[PDB]
Structure 1
């Protein structure tokens, strides 16, 4: 009878579940919001218990909407943000917060409390650092563990488990404490090529104690089955069958890569020329090679972090969809425009795109609208390729005017700034072993025609959109098929369960030259920022 597979994806704001058939088509889906806590600037927290319930509720819902018998679900995969879950000796939520509330036991990925620690770690120039592009980010795990040790010794003395969020999800579902290569290698300095933690690697030697206690010391590749399927409790909690295969966990951006990067063309995907652009709240820029490439300001090279025998170079932008939405929803004209959008059966993006079109006189003139309006998009710092979490945003060409036209121009400027940041990342990869001329893109941005076309225009790269845009849900379900033994490797699941839905190419030379000039201003703004800093010193 028909088999189905479930992908679960816990993002920044919400946990999603998706039910997929063997073709990779989505037959059921659901979402559940998750609580966020912001004690003070730079602090961002969540709750593991709250996350797990959102997951279980979302899954029961997606199954019920697919209208299938739970006996039909053969596998699950779990993916999550690279956030830090903290549990005590008995395994319950243990506080990580200035609030002191144990409910707040998750340090979200975007949290920047540990900038100072990252600086300290970086000062050591220890060997494991070359695999994070030479500069460790406060957003990664070990700087946050160094932060916990120093500020909250109370919590530190009572810790039993330290889980990357996806490994937490997987543990709660199977009891297996086995950790993934993805999360450990990318965010914990585990050596994928030497298959071991580096003892020499900072003031966290105690984590190495009891061999395999707090941080885990059994590590496997994605697609390998965990424990013996869903525990009876977890199964009960999600409305599924005990023993259902569960894959080793994976980080969200990385799930999205499995979900789209392997799509055949129309002819094997060619990684030398194809980058994964995994969008959402933030964006990951994923490229893989058989050879190691060390690249300043880009994480990796990470051996076997996604695909066996591939080195992953991972860049990113910390605020992409989050920046666009901030710029949109921050504007005084937002509520009124949204109201007319609904009246016309439109999204706010469609309403803004309409304004752009009208202002431009012709669609091909839209990009020029921001000739005198520029943005440096480093609102939450820059991850790649500058690797500096202290950078901030700049907008120019501001006027007293508060109209839907102003709002639309600033929205466009935001889109182009993000596209130019993407160009910077791509150019950096092409300077370090790649020949990227194509982006496989996922995320909600890909439903916005102007987002997509200007990314193609600014970068000079074709934009390929998947048939199924929910790339992270799909990727995690694909892992499920591999743990259930329905496909023998990720590569073949990727091939059978994902395909191209749309190809959008760069437009004219005039438009390209415009972006070349915008790109000069983009780079100049960074140097101007550094000069202001110098002058103030």
Structure 2
């Protein structure tokens, strides 16, 4: 039996995996956010713990955790948790979506010209590093008391084991990690008046970082079970879904269209919408791009044409007349809908076809920006709610020229990846290949050479068209 904990933003989810990778139980505990000022997004670390501790006790109450062999955690990335020399929480946690330190972002980058090379990323406000630069400037007294800076998931580890550890995936998200070397970057820390002494110890996601404090062990009805490093939500998310080896990639369609891809070694493209990170497994890295916004984007056009169901415009999209207008929908990305109008003089199911293809071109280019970094998948697992239309799925295949394997499941979340990482650490024998399955294949879409060849020139809209036009 294994435990998997995920410290999300809305709450914490804790799961119980049976000896063969199946989810026997689950518990979720809501978590609120605190917005003291515009752009501020904070959480009380003691609320993360209380939620976790309730979830666990709620889980073991259902079924005894007296057989759990290992435990893993995953959490919201980038959150800064400042603790004093006695492990006490100085100020609330500044979350991934907190955008108060934009200016400290410029400062840091001016302080280390080679910042984007090191972290492989552009310095953003949600990132951990610039927040501490902010605390130093706005709350000097609290900054002076800093002994340790922990990410959300890791603060939780501290409460369970008394240890100070993190995993490469989550660590890289701090902008203090030298992503390539998978180790703290001194230049980075120094630029923030911080030192390794204030960072937790680094582990690969599947490595054991400590055991459960006896107290905790007793409070939850389980032994002093070992606790693995785990990973940040994205990485632990892919782990639980089997997205592990090089050139493996997935798209989720979405309340975000997110493209996540495992690379061979460290790749990066800062000046783009591409984010680079370490994976939650040894010698593995990944890249990812957010995209649409093919749920929003598509409901909008369904109401726009008097339709109310997205299923409807997909159907409508289908009877478009092979009148080729062709249409030409440009989407923009807040988010908001830079929403480029079009070209036309025909119908609603003809416009339904335009919208669906506009999104499709936007996605194709998103994945191509990733691929041009050094990734070339043989196939692309496709999962999510916005991916239930076989028709739209097949369109994305013909547009991008990527084999799209549709798969069901993928609803558990990072928690499943946290329990999987725990299974790995508990079964040094079995091979990863044995402990990391994928979601059950639901369909496989191969690009229709006919439509594919006709589309590549069509995508010559999201060529000069999308570019001549901003001005937004």
TM beyond 0.5: yes
**2:32 equivalent to 1:49:** no
Task: Trace 1:317-328 onto structure 2 (pairs within 5 A).
Answer: 317=290, 320=292, 324=295
* Counterpart for residue 441 of structure 2: 501
TM-score, normalization: structure 1? 0.72
Please point out which of 193, 196, 214 is paired with 1:206. Answer: 193
* Counterpart for residue 431 of structure 1: 372
Distance of 2:59 and 2:334 partners within structure 1: 35
Distance of 1:200 and 1:454 partners within structure 2: 47
CA contact (8 A) 1:12 1:81 kept: yes
Distance of 2:325 and 2:95 partners within structure 1: 37
Going from structure 1 to structure 2, the CA distance change for 1:325 and 1:148 (only over 3 Å counts) comes to farther
Going from structure 1 to structure 2, the CA distance change for 1:526 and 1:77 (only over 3 Å counts) comes to farther
* Counterpart for residue 100 of structure 1: none
Distance of 1:12 and 1:449 partners within structure 2: 32
* Counterpart for residue 345 of structure 2: none
Going from structure 1 to structure 2, the CA distance change for 1:283 and 1:355 (only over 3 Å counts) comes to closer
* Counterpart for residue 208 of structure 2: 225
Residue 394 of structure 1 deviates from its aligned partner by 0.7
CA contact (8 A) 1:261 1:276 kept: no
Please point out which of 128, 144, 166 is paired with 1:179. Answer: 166
Task: Trace 1:107-506 onto structure 2 (pairs within 5 A).
Answer: 107-124=94-111, 126-133=113-120, 135-194=122-181, 196-201=183-188, 204-208=191-195, 211-213=196-198, 215-216=199-200, 218-228=201-211, 230-236=212-218, 239-262=220-243, 271-272=246-247, 274-277=248-251, 281-282=255-256, 284-296=258-270, 297=272, 298-300=274-276, 302=277, 305-310=279-284, 312-317=285-290, 320=292, 324=295, 352-360=309-317, 362=319, 371=327, 373-376=329-332, 378-379=333-334, 393-397=337-341, 413=355, 419-446=360-387, 452-453=393-394, 455-466=396-407, 468-469=409-410, 470-485=412-427, 487=429, 490-494=432-436, 497-506=437-446
Going from structure 1 to structure 2, the CA distance change for 1:354 and 1:184 (only over 3 Å counts) comes to closer
Going from structure 1 to structure 2, the CA distance change for 1:152 and 1:324 (only over 3 Å counts) comes to farther
CA contact (8 A) 2:101 2:134 kept: yes
Going from structure 1 to structure 2, the CA distance change for 1:142 and 1:500 (only over 3 Å counts) comes to same
Describe the superposition over 1:41-89 as per-residue Cα deviations: whole angstroms up to 9, x where unpaired. Answer: 433333322233333333444555xx54311222221111213142442
Residue 510 of structure 1 deviates from its aligned partner by 6.9
- C-alpha RMSD of the superposition: 4.0
TM-score, normalization: structure 2? 0.81
* Counterpart for residue 99 of structure 1: none
Residue 305 of structure 1 deviates from its aligned partner by 3.8
Distance of 2:292 and 2:396 partners within structure 1: 12
Distance of 1:149 and 1:29 partners within structure 2: 40
CA contact (8 A) 2:70 2:227 kept: yes
Going from structure 1 to structure 2, the CA distance change for 1:427 and 1:498 (only over 3 Å counts) comes to closer
Going from structure 1 to structure 2, the CA distance change for 1:142 and 1:281 (only over 3 Å counts) comes to farther
Three-state SS of the structure 1 residue aligned to 2:187 is coil
Unmatched runs of 5 consecutive residues or more in structure 2: 343-347
Distance of 1:57 and 1:417 partners within structure 2: 46
CA contact (8 A) 2:230 2:236 kept: no
Three-state SS of the structure 2 residue aligned to 1:375 is coil
Describe the superposition over 1:321-368 as per-residue Cα deviations: whole angstroms up to 9, x where unpaired. Answer: 6x73598599999xxx9xxxxxxxxxxxxx723322453454x989x9
Unmatched runs of 5 consecutive residues or more in structure 1: 96-104, 264-268, 338-350, 381-391, 399-404, 533-537
* Counterpart for residue 34 of structure 1: 31
Residue 291 of structure 1 deviates from its aligned partner by 4.1
* Counterpart for residue 383 of structure 1: none
CA contact (8 A) 2:5 2:14 kept: yes
Residue 257 of structure 1 deviates from its aligned partner by 1.7
Distance of 1:528 and 1:425 partners within structure 2: 19
Please point out which of 2, 5, 19 is paired with 1:5. Answer: 2
Residue 436 of structure 1 deviates from its aligned partner by 2.5
CA contact (8 A) 2:254 2:385 kept: yes
CA contact (8 A) 2:34 2:43 kept: yes
